[PDB]
Design a protein around this ligand. Structure first.
Ligand SMILES: Fc1ccc(CNCc2ccccc2)cc1
Ligand SMILES: Fc1ccc(CNCc2ccccc2)cc1
Ligand SMILES: Fc1ccc(CNCc2ccccc2)cc1
Ligand SMILES: Fc1ccc(CNCc2ccccc2)cc1
Ligand SMILES: Fc1ccc(CNCc2ccccc2)cc1
Lengths: 348, 348, 348, 348, 348
């Protein structure tokens, strides 16, 4: 017995849709959902999605309030829909999927993922929910996350971090590291050996290794000397080159964070969404150096060092493919006389 | 247990809100209420009101589908709100009243007209509903319509016509003529002696007396001779004067209807609402004569002749107040040498 | 090379999208698509769909401008999507299907109906287009219309009428009667024996048989005597019963059209869409008789007489299922002492 | 002292902006301007323009309520702006010009047409307004309409018809035929010899010559014999050819009007604006014949016969340029063995 | 070959419109431009302008991504339009000019600034673009910025700072100080000797002279003693007077910045735009002192000291006109017994 007034009642008294019974007066004026509280209209939800206001309101209310995989991971693993839940994309203020399975009468393509309409879709199953592991086994295409082992199925250990209500974190009171499983056309497909991005903020950056603690504390010349990174172009790639009108390098987020405490800069996120490699139109406020498309990845500095110090440096220009967050991130490695010149996450 | 989906279910399966149980998927895109019918969004309601889309949707669904007094009569009798119903203003595509009594949680000022909030409002009571006559007796201010006689109360016989779902008609299968009662500050008022407008369409005009049958059939000179209307300016007032750049007269709808069969014309209803006297920016397509504000009343021709012959014709210009549809309509009577020049419903 | 400006160029110079090259300046203000014509913004399209303005603009521009099956027939045959065309629903001012195959990059689920995403959808194939008959043979689910005979396949002769640009007509200069074929899970289905609705307007009604010519010309008592329809309740079912406050019967459009010449009435199409049985909130302007849900079907009078005389009249109330426009329409047959009382298209 | 509330006061009490003083409460909800009338919001204006709601409201209120040249004539004469008035385009529900001279503070480029900003614009001057003829003399570019003769200036007699409040008419109580004058770069131009379109409706068509009276009354074979039009392709050009799937000809509105009495048809005005030649996506309801772009001109039949008989019929295909409504209209004349095949207003 | 999809393709792959070829799917829902990225709609632009969504999208995409003069400077110099570029007003989230020259088909008044329509407009020319200096020479009215000297033309050295992508900065890797030239009616007009505002933030304030370093470090009494500013009312003008219910003075931004580190305050920018003198409705959170219109200018403290210590202090109240950012900023100087009382940027 689903209604706009019942969804709004749950939002008011529970913080989200909890399945409780009751109704509150609701008014819809344009893209905002209001509720009458003692004679005054109070704002409950503002629709920033491409879905009707009341439909988006309900999907937001029915969002998954448990630690869930980050949207970048589920996209990298080809997820089209989520089974009996709404994975909310907080980076886009909209559902990660536009169609649902057993969530909202307006977006539901099916009530159960067993329906033949779901067959060609990679459905996401949450093993922490009863019967979801069995549904993964019966579905043609899908992705499964589990807290433990699923008998017979070879797991892929995922990232330490999951997104809890938009807050990406490594769980202390909750489990955020999941075992991942994928199926394509009924066959369990083996997930590749992968690196993971650390999902850190530029303004809230914290080092997660001694190399990262040393990068932010030590100066450019002594860090490169301490970690033997001579001839690997860290001065351009990680640190940046703001001397000319076009910003040079600055492809690792640790280098951007080190730069941010000295000089502020405008990172224009021209495609606001979650991805393994993010692109920004950067403008440096101190020098006036700028780059229209500055591809930035947040790898653990040790992992970027392991990738860069595992490449052949004798080719003028070659594509270096690396598996990060399950997807193959192609990099452009440029060399000269046995030393690196640049190594950026190649733009496609 | 009121909801958007339940109101929409009733609209789909019953034509209006009938109190039935059930829900249909609803989507709100801007000011339109849609419903999913076999995978396609079908339009259910387009909000032309100043109220939120879903609030207006519900009040429209909960509209009174019985013959009710025309909004002009209800305004003339100073009604503010309706008791336990929604009088829908089809001429404005909105409720006749913005606040309700026991209809919608969003517009309800009270659940029962007995509440002290209703005390200063002239509440409309429908005698055909059980207990509404008793509520009129207990209310401080109000208007009551009844099909029969009320104990002790002296009635006022209203118009022959009522509005059934926007279609104004004189009932054959239903009763449309009501007894009217009014109360101001607890005191049963004596309603005035009044004329009634006939509420006819220009394109669907039908004569309702031998004088009206003769007006439309006979020529100007013959009709005025037959009914001895010489010196009463019917040639200007009723028939019209399209010889100059400014349209002369044409204040009675019977003369507009006679004119409409011969030559078409543009009536610009610049204030779309129901009123005893309607104003139109008229442009005659044949001659090119026009009038910015052409006040038109639809009186029975016999009633207009009775009013015009009941006047003193010795004043150059005087205001002639006539009680029509219970309200006092001011007319401007202009005379010259004992004869009328014009008699129009005063632009005030 | 698809763009908003190119679609708009085609609309301006060709009347619809014809694949021509060129661009015109376009401006989008809210839900309207405008074009600059000599310095003035001219309206090109107003979006009445649930899709983004520019997406709907393109699908409308790319609509099928050839006689196509009526949306009621296509729904009745369970069609989900059209192959390499846009069937435009003129009764809803929106595409008949929200997803396309090889039409618009925004709505396209696939470029060709052979893609595995189309497999569970009943794709509509137009035999008049090269290679569409072969695609029907290869598709798992689908509906096929052809002007001629298909090798091996047993046809179903459809309605005489098709919809050409929203104008339903029986072709004289074009062919509008199609052979229909259906496939479910790869198996060519045997379509049922069906009656067809005549798709006539209330205001533009024309008789299509001597019985219909006699119905509109003769009086109630004479027609029923001439065609020996005594005891079949035609006086209530077809003609109508406007004597009481609730309109009795009036389920056949021929009786509504006969009534319309004498007295006008308000048909409130509360679910604006194309269907075999249409429901209307009717209000008769002469009597004041009304019905919230008045189910109306436009069968050829001969076909309704053949259906009503092919029934057992000994049950107080039974459901009579009739295959009309390929779908099973349930009727409610009410009898008393061997005679009919009512026979309406069941409100279910 | 201009305000939204004062414009709205004038609209309510005068039908349009008359310069009167006073204010009424106004509320703006989205694109509609409402006014509070006795506690209920009444709609005053719905913005169908590309301008802000209140700006468009004011320009509409300040529209020219005198017979003015039709927007097709004003465009043909290359007018950009009107001097101290608003020419309202009723075919587009918007001002004919987006910028004003002494009308609205929001759209005003200048308070007087003498300002140097107006210098490169062809300003329209209405001779019926005091001082407008003198302003035409002083302006660099402009168009002037007058009821009488202007000293020294050689006139161009315009169309018999002008547009009075959207109603195109030939004045009986007003003058609608104007003398036209044009100036380009300070030089009084000699306007060309021109034909005029008759600006008639398809549904409200009236013949304006004996040839037009004979066209609508006589049959195709009789009319062509009476007026000796053998070999001029009137059977295709004027009458139409609905035998094939593509509608043949039908370029003259008199032939469309003759056709309309017999069979109805859908004229899709895909570019809603006023022009000398109008294009329509036509669909004939009887035959099912259709044409994506059917160019239609309303010339007096005598003028079309004078044009078609004034041509050389020995070229397979040539462009025939005709001055109509002051603009050069290109026609495509197709001949074969000394006879016409088609002569349509060229799709360019 | 300009299109919405091509502009959106450039925004996605280049950060701005770079002239590249290609298209991405675009959807417009209300005032937001979305793009389909792997089946999910990602937001690309939200229209905060008074222009149509797609028109504003294109002008924003085509914005000048080089250091350009600040909008306050170009307004002060009377600029109406920019030649073959879009100067984007980041303080208003809209183009600095509503009409373009060779940028967008919808906003273009001309393709080249040489067109006679541009003649009365002060067109902005960027000398850094090939042929723009020659176009300035040929234009009737205009403003020209150059990095070097233009033979014969007497330059005006502009501000040290220019706006690079909304970030106002003094160039280190780019040149931000330009030579300015102006022409009025074909004549090169001599630019006045002017002071420049420093364009600093209240929250991000940095001193740019020893006097400013001393103002923020030293207390009120020792700064005024060190710089001999006794009897010049710096205690009221620069520092502020929060003792009464109406805030006293606080007209220099350096004084506001000094105050901000001690006590926070609400600066209500009631006219959000770039100007030499900014007005704010200030409310001091600590004391509760407030001023409806508090005019604030950011002059270098040395320049304000040079202006105040160059005035005659014997008049009770006089207007002191000073040229700042090329425009004459009139100040109100109030004196008493040879000492200043107040000196604020006079409100007009
Ligand atoms: F839970 C969900 C998480 C993410 C999504 C959207 N992923 C779209 C995609 C599909 C195929 C390949 C790459 C991306 C949908 C639901
Ligand atoms: F049923 C209804 C019918 C009419 C109304 C609105 N009447 C407004 C009014 C109030 C006082 C004097 C004049 C007009 C409200 C409900
Ligand atoms: F051409 C088209 C015509 C019609 C449609 C929509 N039919 C929806 C439907 C699906 C299943 C059963 C009943 C109705 C889609 C495309
Ligand atoms: F009164 C008016 C009537 C018409 C207009 C608009 N005419 C636009 C145009 C300009 C140049 C050539 C062709 C068309 C503006 C005001
Ligand atoms: F690049 C541009 C920068 C600024 C503008 C807007 N300046 C408007 C103005 C005009 C006259 C005097 C004062 C202000 C337009 C384009």
């Amino acid at each position: 017995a689903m209604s706009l007034e019942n969804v709004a009642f749950n939002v008011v008294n529970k913080g989200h849709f909890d399945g409780q019974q009751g109704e509150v007066p609701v008014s819809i004026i344009n893209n905002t959902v209001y509720t009458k509280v003692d004679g005054v209209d109070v704002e409950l939800f503002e629709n920033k999605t491409t879905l009707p206001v009341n439909v988006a309101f309900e999907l937001w209310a029915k969002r998954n309030i448990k630690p869930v995989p980050e949207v970048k991971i589920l996209n990298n693993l080809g997820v089209d829909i989520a089974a009996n839940t709404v994975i909310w994309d907080y980076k886009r203020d909209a559902p990660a999927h536009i169609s649902t399975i057993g969530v909202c009468s307006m977006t539901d393509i099916a009530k159960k993922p067993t329906e033949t309409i779901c067959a060609p879709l990679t459905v996401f199953f949450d093993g922490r929910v009863d019967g979801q592991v069995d549904l993964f086994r019966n579905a043609r295409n899908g992705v499964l996350i589990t807290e433990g082992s699923v008998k017979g199925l070879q797991p892929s250990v995922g990232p330490k971090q999951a997104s809890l209500n938009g807050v990406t974190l490594i769980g202390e009171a909750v489990k955020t590291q999941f075992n991942y499983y994928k199926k394509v056309d009924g066959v369990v497909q083996q997930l590749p050996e992968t690196y993971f991005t650390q999902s850190r903020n530029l303004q809230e950056f914290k080092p997660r290794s001694q190399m990262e603690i040393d990068f932010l504390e030590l100066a450019m010349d002594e860090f490169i000397e301490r970690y033997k990174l001579e001839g690997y172009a860290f001065e351009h790639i990680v640190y940046g080159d703001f001397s000319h009108s076009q910003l040079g390098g600055l492809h690792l987020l640790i280098g951007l964070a080190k730069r941010f405490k000295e000089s502020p800069f405008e990172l224009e996120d021209f495609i606001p969404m979650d991805s393994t490699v993010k692109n920004y139109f950067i403008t440096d406020a101190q020098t006036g150096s700028s780059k229209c498309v500055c591809s930035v990845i947040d790898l653990l500095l040790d992992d970027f060092v392991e990738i860069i110090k595992s490449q052949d440096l004798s080719v003028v220009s070659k594509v270096v493919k690396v598996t990060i967050d399950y997807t193959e991130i192609s990099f452009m490695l440029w060399c000269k006389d046995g030393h690196v010149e640049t190594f950026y996450p190649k733009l496609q």
